[PDB]
Enzyme design. Structure first.
Site, PDB file in Angstrom:
ATOM      1  N   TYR A 137       0.898  -1.123   0.056  1.00  0.00           N
ATOM      2  CA  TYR A 137       0.061  -0.030   0.076  1.00  0.00           C
ATOM      3  C   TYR A 137       0.884   1.292  -0.118  1.00  0.00           C
ATOM      4  CZ  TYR A 137      -4.354  -2.678   0.953  1.00  0.00           C
ATOM      5  OH  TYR A 137      -5.322  -3.472   0.775  1.00  0.00           O
ATOM      6  N   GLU A 174     -13.884  25.080 -12.025  1.00  0.00           N
ATOM      7  CA  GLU A 174     -13.321  24.952 -13.445  1.00  0.00           C
ATOM      8  C   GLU A 174     -12.980  23.515 -13.778  1.00  0.00           C
ATOM      9  OE1 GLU A 174     -10.649  28.069 -14.098  1.00  0.00           O
ATOM     10  OE2 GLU A 174      -9.425  26.843 -15.434  1.00  0.00           O
TER      11      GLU A 174
HETATM   12  N1  LIG Z   1      -4.544   2.128  -3.585  1.00  0.00           N
HETATM   13  C1  LIG Z   1      -4.910   1.541  -2.219  1.00  0.00           C
HETATM   14  N2  LIG Z   1      -6.161   0.916  -1.958  1.00  0.00           N
HETATM   15  C2  LIG Z   1      -6.573   0.588  -0.628  1.00  0.00           C
HETATM   16  C3  LIG Z   1      -5.715   0.908   0.340  1.00  0.00           C
HETATM   17  N3  LIG Z   1      -6.243   0.333   1.540  1.00  0.00           N
HETATM   18  C4  LIG Z   1      -7.312  -0.352   1.381  1.00  0.00           C
HETATM   19  N4  LIG Z   1      -7.470  -0.133  -0.105  1.00  0.00           N
HETATM   20  C5  LIG Z   1      -8.535  -0.747  -0.876  1.00  0.00           C
HETATM   21  O1  LIG Z   1      -9.693  -0.333  -0.791  1.00  0.00           O
HETATM   22  C6  LIG Z   1     -10.551  -1.161  -0.784  1.00  0.00           C
HETATM   23  C7  LIG Z   1     -11.522  -1.542   0.007  1.00  0.00           C
HETATM   24  O2  LIG Z   1     -10.719  -1.744   1.499  1.00  0.00           O
HETATM   25  P1  LIG Z   1     -10.842  -0.650   2.384  1.00  0.00           P
HETATM   26  O3  LIG Z   1     -10.978   0.953   2.086  1.00  0.00           O
HETATM   27  O4  LIG Z   1      -9.484  -0.840   3.491  1.00  0.00           O
HETATM   28  O5  LIG Z   1     -12.306  -0.779   3.403  1.00  0.00           O
HETATM   29  P2  LIG Z   1     -12.940   0.288   4.276  1.00  0.00           P
HETATM   30  O6  LIG Z   1     -13.119   1.487   3.495  1.00  0.00           O
HETATM   31  O7  LIG Z   1     -12.123   0.573   5.608  1.00  0.00           O
HETATM   32  O8  LIG Z   1     -14.348  -0.126   4.965  1.00  0.00           O
HETATM   33  P3  LIG Z   1     -14.506  -1.324   6.067  1.00  0.00           P
HETATM   34  O9  LIG Z   1     -13.159  -1.830   6.623  1.00  0.00           O
HETATM   35  O10 LIG Z   1     -15.341  -2.649   5.622  1.00  0.00           O
HETATM   36  O11 LIG Z   1     -15.223  -0.771   7.265  1.00  0.00           O
HETATM   37  C8  LIG Z   1      -9.761  -2.777  -1.315  1.00  0.00           C
HETATM   38  O12 LIG Z   1     -10.043  -2.948  -2.763  1.00  0.00           O
HETATM   39  C9  LIG Z   1      -8.513  -2.471  -1.017  1.00  0.00           C
HETATM   40  O13 LIG Z   1      -7.621  -3.041  -1.845  1.00  0.00           O
HETATM   41  C10 LIG Z   1      -4.363   1.610   0.290  1.00  0.00           C
HETATM   42  O14 LIG Z   1      -3.870   1.892   1.183  1.00  0.00           O
HETATM   43  N5  LIG Z   1      -4.267   2.240  -1.107  1.00  0.00           N
END
Ligand SMILES: Nc1nc2c(ncn2[C@@H]2O[C@H](COP(=O)(O)OP(=O)(O)OP(=O)(O)O)[C@@H](O)[C@H]2O)c(=O)[nH]1
Ligand SMILES: Nc1ncnc2c1ncn2[C@@H]1O[C@H](COP(=O)(O)OP(=O)(O)CP(=O)(O)O)[C@@H](O)[C@H]1O
Ligand SMILES: COc1cc(-c2nccc3[nH]c(-c4ccc5cc[nH]c5c4)nc23)cc(OC)c1OC
Ligand SMILES: Nc1nc2c(ncn2[C@@H]2O[C@H](COP(=O)(O)OP(=O)(O)O)[C@@H](O)[C@H]2O)c(=O)[nH]1
Ligand SMILES: [Ca+2]
Ligand SMILES: [Mg+2]
Ligand SMILES: [Mg+2]
Ligand SMILES: [Mg+2]
Lengths: 427, 339, 54, 439
Positions: D224, D254
């Site tokens: 990440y 814009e």
């Molecule tokens: N590019 C990127 N994607 C992330 C990261 N952390 C989580 N994701 C992505 O975000 C998507 C959903 O996961 P999360 O955002 O962690 O979950 P959340 O929004 O906290 O919701 P809950 O934990 O279920 O309450 C997944 O496809 C993960 O791969 C990050 O640090 N960078």
């Protein structure tokens, strides 16, 4: 996120005590309950299974239950028996006599409120309780009958918490009594309705592994429980150690259970090791991946090639290449795509934990929600119907107040569960 | 062990490719909606190109070039040739064509032709119509109900004797993931079985050479399919020339010109998935031994005797080049003139 | 290739180059939707407690 | 000077917010303790960087940001990390148990318990604005919080801030790094409920970022941290016009005017070049022509798709470093003759160009090398709809058997919302084909 552990009955307490033996070693806790490990990474999530005691000691959040006092005394006599909290020992004096009715309706009903008071005491001291895990067998009377009554009552008080079970399935190859198909069928009806995840530990598969693979001609229960202990440690690795995934019981259930009733998992472990037998050659990542998916490594006596995988969770332990793990896991799905339902895309999830189990540099744990588990329920149903058609041995249960119609309903619900697995096997 | 899916059951060529792949012992056919494939023998319409190349752990290949349709449709071809500077409106090997929907540019073409004391008879697009006066032509366009092009009907075709017959040359062309342009050794000549009658265009059998419309049929050669060795022998005896010098040189120039023009639009050189495609070019040759391009088909069918050889060539050249297993029948078209 | 609206400062420049010319729910509704989902939760939960009571 | 408030929702939105604000501090010279020595007006000001930073009497520069997660592990690292003192404690909002990868849990069950508090904290930032223009919302599609709570928040922001612009930075799910099998469900659900409330949304496919990190940064298994530092560079390229002096994309309005001619088609494609590894010894600095040509290679896009088989409605080129207009126009002329760039007939075929002379900043110890010039292209092309087709198809496969649907119904959601959301996505796909495909 704390978990409350419960072991009920002889089998439940024996595999439960050995589970606490294994993970206490992994986390560096002595039989006294003091921490003597070498890494602070063992204590980052120690609170999931342990409470912090006076003197900065760690006491398991475990409740020990039985209607017979003897087996619980052997636990206290066991190597790690002194680690448990004395007030968490809740036992009667009758014994269930391998009678589900005694565990569920009569003898167990007298003791169940005493257990719930310890459960409440342990849960009240939890910052954010995620749920419960129960170890028990389905073939006896206490872990089967009283264990499922305990589950129902816990769901009544904690309806939004996760209920998890490690349920040991009866097998004629390791059979104590002829009524075990009765106790198991009545139990499965309960587990279908009131658990979120059930790990199906089949005594038939444990015996076959000890005999055919481990070359043990006369497997003891100790040999069977060595496989159960390694498996239980594997499936709880994510919860007990910090890793890239911050996983918990509810997120596991959401991702593994596409339909509420189909929550019975096939556990698997690699490499299969004999107790005390040293492993000198570490497996490679390709070897771990092909063994963990091998039918010979499944803890449930089902042929995966006879069904389809709805979901799969895989846990790798040790120092290894995440690239090689991802490649091997993708290789298995791509070369065996027919055995994964196409209407659940990307249904295999992989986690890697740097800390390997004791005595192994590398290991892998398999958790499959496969429609082939219907074979296990079909076999129990067949052994059930063979006696029920003649109402054989029913007087043990009608003497405790049960009616034959409750047997008919339990038999019907499990046949319904078998047909539900069949429907998604053909979808 | 490679994997593939089949999504065009009506393709005789890729039905033979499916059999060849399974017979290798190293390919497995999955269910049609199984996404974990290496190769996709896709459908002809609305192929989900957007879903390819997103499967981790899988190199994915498809038997169709996204965007190649603008070469393989009548109206789109005329648009491509007239608007692409690589081909231009001055392009010498395409008959004069005009896109009309049910133009004042086409009306001004016949107005200069017939009123200029020259020949003037054209053809339709998409049942067709060959007329000398444009009144009939446009009237049929509105009655049909689809976009049509009006193309000069080659009034002076090369006529095979004995028979005074008409004919069209079919060339099969394979373009692989590297955009190599492979001309299959064997062409075919779809033949007309009736004497070419310039007097009456209502006779559809001596003016249209489709194998189906020829349904009289089979007098001179089987299935009205004459092939390259005999046709080469004919031009040697009849016209003292060869097929290579008099016809194929122009054919190879037209094939390379068309595909090189659209290469920036359709190439998968740096794409997350790969494409190959088998094309069918149809040519007309006049009596001056000049070769004309009539159309190109994006999903051609092979000649019966050539199925086993061409489909085996598709496997070796287009599929095994990407997915290897555990003298050539194609002529690679390439030319680098320095100027 | 006409360069239009060229603005320059010490931080940089911006401009436009043209090649060819052309040819909500209210607060109360949201609270209603959220409260209707909670009612379905408590009904579904009440059915479980009724079932456990039997 | 019009202030912008950043809102980071869920793990993905929070961790990407960390890397963005770390990059912002390095670009503006703000130290982890919040001081900005180059800022001579102490205690306030109306400079361009004040769009994203407020100022205390002690000269400390505070991000106009709020971090929200229904679970505290991620934001706790912000509370204890390098930039602990950068944020006021009221800017960091956490619950105790998350949405468990369940849109219904984040939107209905848990979201209703915390939203009024989040809106209250947002109001605290808004009340320190003299002319708030709108919000920048960072969230994932797949997470229960990033999908469920964000959509709930976007609805309320439309009510409370009716005339404020709302921009999205959305992480599109990729199996290579995903956490949940139900992420196609959460993605379609959140896009449907948020569609009317977002003015411009920049989708980032984790698959595209993953492969760029593997191919161009030679990282076998990107974390990440690798992905978020690359995403921050792109985000910084897009927001630089709001935080620095310039004439192009000076306010959130814009962005809609220049990138979004139609409301529902508000997902511009971002393409960034050059991505060069720090570990690369010998490097050949790429010219204006080479980085501009790289903007039309799908391997450099934030979403893998083929713009040659769609149509353009707008194209912005955002340069940083040694770039002059003469070289841009020469590069565009050469590219136009060799690339397949077709605009729709009701749009002029032209590029809007912005140039900032300071080259892109890289985090010390990061994976990206220092380059003398970089460019981020923002194009509104119908080809981005390929991502919708991929997502909707995975949705259809699972929903046909109602797999996992009971998890959402159990949280108070109705089955009809699934078909409602999916039927809206079907309409969105029809709009994109309509505009971009010729008969
Ligand atoms: N590019 C990127 N994607 C992330 C990261 N952390 C989580 N994701 C992505 O975000 C998507 C959903 O996961 P999360 O955002 O962690 O979950 P959340 O929004 O906290 O919701 P809950 O934990 O279920 O309450 C997944 O496809 C993960 O791969 C990050 O640090 N960078
Ligand atoms: N300008 C032209 N001049 C003379 N004949 C022409 C012509 N255009 C078409 N034809 C005749 O029409 C016949 C079929 O050509 P056309 O390409 O229009 O049909 P079709 O689409 O069925 C070929 P296929 O489907 O096999 O690729 C040709 O054999 C030719 O005799
Ligand atoms: C890998 O092993 C464990 C993981 C988790 C876990 N934790 C958080 C989020 C988690 N998503 C998942 C998960 C599971 C299956 C699939 C299929 C497609 N996508 C998936 C995600 N599994 C999660 C929990 C465990 O114990 C409770 C574990 O050990 C048993
Ligand atoms: N794997 C395993 N199975 C056991 C063990 N002890 C009993 N069983 C099984 O459990 C069933 C008997 O249940 P038991 O636990 O003895 O009854 P209870 O104490 O009244 O709950 C039989 O099918 C046994 O095969 C054990 O230590 N290990
Ligand atoms: Ca100031
Ligand atoms: Mg016993
Ligand atoms: Mg045709
Ligand atoms: Mg989270």
């Amino acid at each position: 996120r704390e978990i409350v552990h419960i072991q009920a009955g002889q089998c439940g307490n024996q595999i439960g005590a050995k589970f606490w033996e294994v993970i206490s070693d992994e986390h560096g806790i002595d039989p006294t309950g003091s921490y003597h490990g070498d890494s602070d990474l063992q204590l980052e999530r120690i609170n999931v299974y342990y409470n912090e005691a006076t003197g900065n000691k760690y006491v398991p959040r475990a409740i020990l239950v039985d209607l017979e006092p003897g087996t619980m005394d052997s636990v206290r006599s066991g190597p790690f028996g002194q680690i448990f909290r004395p007030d968490n020992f809740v036992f009667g004096q009758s014994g269930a006599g391998n009678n589900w009715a005694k565990g569920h309706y009569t003898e167990g009903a007298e003791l169940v409120d005493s257990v719930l008071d310890v459960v409440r005491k342990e849960s009240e001291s939890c910052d954010c309780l995620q749920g419960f895990q129960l170890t028990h067998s389905l073939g006896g009377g206490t872990g089967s009958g009283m264990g499922t009554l305990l589950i129902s009552k816990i769901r009544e008080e904690y309806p939004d918490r996760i209920m998890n079970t490690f349920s040991v399935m009866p097998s004629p190859k390791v059979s104590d009594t002829v009524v075990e198909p009765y106790n198991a069928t009545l139990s499965v009806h309960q587990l279908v309705e009131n658990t979120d995840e059930t790990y199906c530990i089949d005594n038939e598969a444990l015996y076959d592994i000890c005999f055919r693979t481990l070359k043990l001609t006369t497997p003891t229960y100790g040999d069977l429980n060595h496989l159960v202990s390694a498996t239980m440690s594997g499936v709880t690795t994510c919860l007990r150690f910090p890793g890239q995934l911050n996983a918990d019981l509810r997120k596991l259930a959401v991702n593994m259970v596409p339909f509420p009733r189909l929550h019975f998992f096939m556990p698997g472990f690699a490499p299969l090791t004999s107790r005390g037998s040293q492993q000198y050659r570490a497996l490679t990542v390709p070897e771990l991946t092909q063994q963990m998916f091998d039918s010979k490594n499944m803890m449930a006596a089902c042929d995966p090639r006879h069904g389809r995988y709805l979901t799969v969770a895989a846990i790798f332990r040790g120092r290894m290449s995440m690239k090689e793990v991802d490649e091997q896991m993708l290789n298995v799905q791509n070369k065996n795509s027919s055995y994964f339902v196409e209407w659940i895309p990307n249904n295999v999830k992989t986690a890697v934990c740097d800390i390997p189990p004791r005595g192994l540099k590398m290991s892998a744990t398999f958790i499959g929600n496969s429609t082939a588990i219907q074979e296990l329920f079909k076999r129990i149903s067949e052994q059930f119907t063979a006696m029920f058609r003649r109402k054989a041995f029913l007087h043990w249960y009608t003497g405790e107040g049960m009616d034959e119609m409750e047997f008919t309903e339990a038999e019907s619900n499990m046949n319904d569960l078998v047909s539900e697995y069949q429907q998604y096997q053909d979808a | 062990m490679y994997t593939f899916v089949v999504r065009d059951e009506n393709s005789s060529v890729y039905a033979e490719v499916s059999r060849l792949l399974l017979a290798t012992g190293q390919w497995k056919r999955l269910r049609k909606d199984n996404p974990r494939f290496n190769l996709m023998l896709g459908e002809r319409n609305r192929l989900p190109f957007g879903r390819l190349g997103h499967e981790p752990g899988l190199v994915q290949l498809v038997n169709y070039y996204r965007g190649a349709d603008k070469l393989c449709r009548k109206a789109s071809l005329v648009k491509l040739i007239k608007t692409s500077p690589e081909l231009s409106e001055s392009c010498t090997w395409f008959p004069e064509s005009y896109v009309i929907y049910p133009r004042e540019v086409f009306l001004a073409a016949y107005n200069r032709r017939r009123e200029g004391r020259e020949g003037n008879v054209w053809i339709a697009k998409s049942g067709i119509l060959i007329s000398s006066e444009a009144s009939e032509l446009l009237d049929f366009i509105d009655e049909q109900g689809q976009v049509h092009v009006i193309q000069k009907y080659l009034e002076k075709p090369l006529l095979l004797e004995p028979g005074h017959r008409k004919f069209d040359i079919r060339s099969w062309v394979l373009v692989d993931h590297l955009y190599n342009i492979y001309l299959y050794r064997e062409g075919v000549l779809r033949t007309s079985s009736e004497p070419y009658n310039s007097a009456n265009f209502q006779d559809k059998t001596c003016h249209l050479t489709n194998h189906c419309i020829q349904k009289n049929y089979g007098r001179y050669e089987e299935g009205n399919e004459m092939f390259f060795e005999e046709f080469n022998q004919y031009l040697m005896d009849a016209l003292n020339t060869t097929l290579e010098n008099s016809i194929l040189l122009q054919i190879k120039h037209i094939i390379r010109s068309c595909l090189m023009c659209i290469e920036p639009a359709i190439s998968t050189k740096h794409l997350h998935y790969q494409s190959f495609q088998l094309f069918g070019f149809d040519f007309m040759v006049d009596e001056e031994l000049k070769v004309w391009l009539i159309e190109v088909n994006g999903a051609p069918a092979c000649a019966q005797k050539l199925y086993a050889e061409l489909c085996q060539g598709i496997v070796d050249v287009a599929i095994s080049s990407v997915f290897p297993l555990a003298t050539s029948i194609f002529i690679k078209l390439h030319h680098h003139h320095h100027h | 290739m006409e360069v239009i609206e060229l603005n320059k400062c010490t931080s940089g420049q911006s401009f436009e180059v043209i090649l060819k010319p052309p040819s909500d729910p209210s607060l109360e509704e949201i609270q209603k939707k959220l409260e209707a989902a909670e009612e379905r939760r408590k009904y579904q939960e009440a059915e479980l407690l009724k079932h456990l009571a039997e | 000077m019009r202030e912008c408030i950043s809102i980071h929702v869920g793990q993905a939105g929070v961790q990407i917010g960390n890397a963005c604000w770390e990059l912002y501090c390095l670009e503006h010279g703000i130290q982890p303790d919040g001081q900005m020595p180059s800022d001579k007006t102490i205690g306030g000001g109306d400079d361009s960087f004040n769009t994203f930073f407020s100022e205390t009497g002690a000269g400390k520069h505070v991000p106009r940001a709020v971090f929200v997660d229904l679970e505290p592990t991620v934001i706790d690292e912000v509370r204890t990390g390098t930039y602990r003192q950068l944020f006021h404690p009221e800017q960091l909002i956490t619950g105790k148990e998350d949405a468990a990868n369940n849109y219904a849990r984040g939107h209905y069950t848990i979201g209703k318990e915390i939203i009024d508090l989040v809106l209250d904290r947002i109001r605290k930032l808004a009340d320190q604005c003299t002319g708030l223009q709108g919000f920048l919302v960072f969230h994932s599609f797949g997470g229960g919080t990033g999908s469920g709570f964000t959509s709930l928040l976007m609805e309320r922001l439309s009510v409370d801030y009716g005339k404020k612009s709302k921009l999205e930075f959305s992480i599109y799910p990729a199996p290579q790094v995903s956490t949940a099998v139900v992420e196609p469900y959460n993605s379609i659900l959140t896009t449907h409920t948020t569609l009317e409330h977002s003015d411009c949304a920049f989708m980032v496919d984790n698959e595209a970022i993953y492969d760029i990190c593997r191919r161009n940064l030679d990282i076998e298994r990107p974390t990440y941290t690798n992905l978020n530092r690359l995403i921050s560079q792109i985000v910084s390229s897009i927001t630089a016009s709001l935080r620095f002096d310039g004439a192009l994309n000076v306010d959130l309005t814009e962005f809609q005017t220049n990138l979004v001619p139609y409301p529902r088609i508000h997902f511009p494609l971002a393409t960034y070049a050059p991505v060069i590894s720090a570990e690369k010894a010998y490097h050949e600095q790429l010219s204006v022509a080479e980085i501009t040509n790289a903007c039309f290679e799908p391997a450099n896009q934030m979403v893998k798709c083929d713009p040659r088989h769609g149509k353009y409605m707008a194209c912005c080129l955002l340069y940083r470093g040694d770039v002059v207009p003469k070289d841009v126009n020469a590069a565009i002329a050469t590219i136009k003759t060799k690339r397949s760039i077709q605009f729709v007939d009701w749009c002029p075929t032209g590029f809007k160009v912005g140039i900032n002379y300071q080259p892109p900043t890289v985090v010390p110890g990061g994976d990206l090398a220092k380059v003398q010039r970089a460019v981020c292209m923002l194009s509104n092309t119908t080809a981005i709809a390929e991502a919708w087709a991929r997502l909707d198809h995975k949705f259809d496969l699972m929903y046909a058997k109602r797999a996992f649907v009971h998890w959402y119904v159990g949280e108070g959601m109705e089955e009809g919302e699934f078909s409602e959301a999916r039927e809206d996505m079907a309409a969105l796909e029809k709009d994109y084909e309509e505009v971009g495909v010729d008969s």
